[PDB]
Each structure stands twice: as structure tokens, then as C-alpha cells.
Ligand binder design. Structure first.
Ligand SMILES: [Mg+2]
Ligand code: NA
Ligand code: NA
Length: 279
């Protein structure tokens, strides 16, 4: 399948070169997989989700996304126009408030929730969790991410936007999850992206068009925008049977475009998520 005039990041993950605008992908499109977006919520009514999104848990008064961030990230996972895995099922877990902030104890609880809740859900091709969030180093946050991964979920987390080594941030610094840095449309490491030995992969993160609240769309930048490209890619690859939740991060690194990013510090991987789709 092919989506013409796609957002640059979708085109990028289906090309060996920057500058294209068609997203090429297998029509299965993540059907039968599930992605939990652990964030500010998801505006499930947005027409771009086509009824495939639903809130499953909130840690605040409402399940509504009063911010937009979670809706944007969910859109990069699985919206029709802006999503990597256009037929995945999206589940929203609101651990962040409407200002985009959250306490680590609540974020931990939401990870634990996903590890359990997946047993209520029918996700025959597997389960992914996208965590476009984090703060300073916390062993407890890292442990929660590790548990979620161990429970059988493909965990993708943001590297952070500190232009610093991700070792000092969580859940970025948890080794066992998939830590995602950000790139721009010219294959430079995004100016804000964290780096370091703990990164597993880069995805598109600068100027990413996706869904927003009020039934809208907008372009924003962050390792939060790179993370759902990887989460969506994992769901897509799991639906194709190419990999599993436990091995998807490694598979994505194995199959990535290698050596194509600039301003990658020595010791950080030079790997950009790639679907290797051959019609
Ligand atoms: Mg890792
Ligand atoms: Na996300
Ligand atoms: Na470089």
C-alpha cells in the first residue's frame, strides 16, 4: 500500500533516503495488534481514529485529553492519515494531567495497569506500549518499565529532549525497553534529542504532523513524536509476524537504516527506524 503526500516521518521510515513523501507499507497495517498510549489521554472521538481508539484508564478526574500531547502521539501510532500502523487498536491510559505533567508514582501505576489490563483485551498479534514521557533518573520508574516489558509488552520510551546523555533520565535509561531518540527531515539528530549508549534507535521527531484535540491537527517536535513512530512500527512488524514483543526493539535496530544521521556523538547508535517494505 502507499499513502501519497504523507507526513515526512512516515515517508522516512519506508525509505533508505530522506526527502521522499510517499509512505509505503504492507496493507495489514498493524491489524490485530494493540498499542497502549500512556500519556495525557486520547481524544477517541477524533475522526482520524476511525473508532479504533478508546480510553481504558485515567488517573485524573476525567479521561479526556485536555492537552493534546497524548492525542498527537496516538495519531502517530495509529491514525488513518498520520499513523504508522493504520489498523492497530489504540488504548489510552491517562497518567499525565492536562498540562502534560505527572508524578512518577502515577506513571508507575499506569505501567502496572497496562501489564495487567492486556489480559482483558483481544490482541492476537501482540501488545505495544508507547511512553512519550519521563523526567530525571528514577530506579523505580525504570523498574516499572522493565516489568511492563517482562510482562510481554513491547515498551518504547522517549529518550528525552535535554540534548544530554539519556543515562540521567527515566524511563529512558532502563536498558530492557526500547529507548528512542529523534531525528529531523534532513537526517540530523534533532537539536533537542538526548543521546547516549542507552539509546536503541532513532525515529522522526522534528516537525511531526499528527492529530490534536478539538478534532484538529498540528505539527510539533520532540522525542515524544519519535517514540510512537517506533511503537507503531513494532505493532506493524508484529502483525506481519516478523518479530515479537520481546525481540522487536532488537529487530528494529537490526533492520534500521545505518549510518545515515549527522551529529550523532561517538558511543550513540546511528540507526533510524525502517520498515524494509518491499512490495
Ligand atoms: Mg534498550
Ligand atoms: Na507515545
Ligand atoms: Na553522525
Amino acid at each position: 500500500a502507499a499513502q501519497t503526500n504523507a507526513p515526512w516521518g512516515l515517508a522516512r521510515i519506508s525509505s533508505t533516503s530522506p526527502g521522499t513523501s510517499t509512505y509505503y507499507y504492507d496493507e495489514s497495517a498493524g491489524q490485530g495488534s494493540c498499542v497502549y498510549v500512556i500519556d495525557t489521554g486520547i481524544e477517541a472521538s477524533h475522526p482520524e481514529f476511525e473508532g479504533r481508539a478508546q480510553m481504558v484508564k485515567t488517573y485524573y478526574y476525567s479521561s479526556r485529553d485536555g492537552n493534546g500531547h497524548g492525542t498527537h502521539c496516538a495519531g502517530t501510532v495509529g491514525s488513518r492519515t498520520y499513523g504508522v500502523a493504520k489498523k492497530t487498536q489504540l488504548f489510552g491510559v491517562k497518567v499525565l494531567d492536562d498540562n502534560g505533567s505527572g508524578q512518577y508514582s502515577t506513571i508507575i501505576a499506569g505501567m502496572d495497569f497496562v501489564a495487567s489490563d492486556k489480559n482483558n483485551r483481544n490482541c492476537p498479534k501482540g501488545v505495544v506500549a508507547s511512553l512519550s514521557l519521563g523526567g530525571g533518573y528514577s530506579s523505580s520508574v525504570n523498574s516499572a518499565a522493565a516489568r511492563l516489558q517482562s510482562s510481554g509488552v513491547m515498551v518504547a520510551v522517549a529518550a528525552g529532549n535535554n540534548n544530554a546523555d539519556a543515562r540521567n533520565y527515566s524511563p529512558a535509561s532502563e536498558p530492557s525497553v526500547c529507548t528512542v531518540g529523534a531525528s529531523d527531515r534532513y537526517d540530523r539528530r534533532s537539536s533537542f534529542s538526548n543521546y547516549g549508549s542507552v539509546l536503541d534507535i532513532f525515529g522522526p521527531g522534528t516537525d511531526i504532523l499528527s492529530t490534536w484535540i478539538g478534532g484538529s491537527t498540528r505539527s510539533i517536535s520532540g522525542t515524544s513524536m519519535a517514540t510512537p513512530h517506533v511503537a507503531g512500527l513494532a505493532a506493524y512488524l508484529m502483525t506481519l509476524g516478523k518479530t515479537t514483543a520481546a525481540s522487536a526493539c532488537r529487530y528494529i535496530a537490526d533492520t534500521a537504516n545505518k549510518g545515515d544521521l549527522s551529529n550523532i556523538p561517538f558511543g550513540t547508535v546511528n540507526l533510524l527506524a525502517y520498515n524494509n517494505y518491499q512490495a
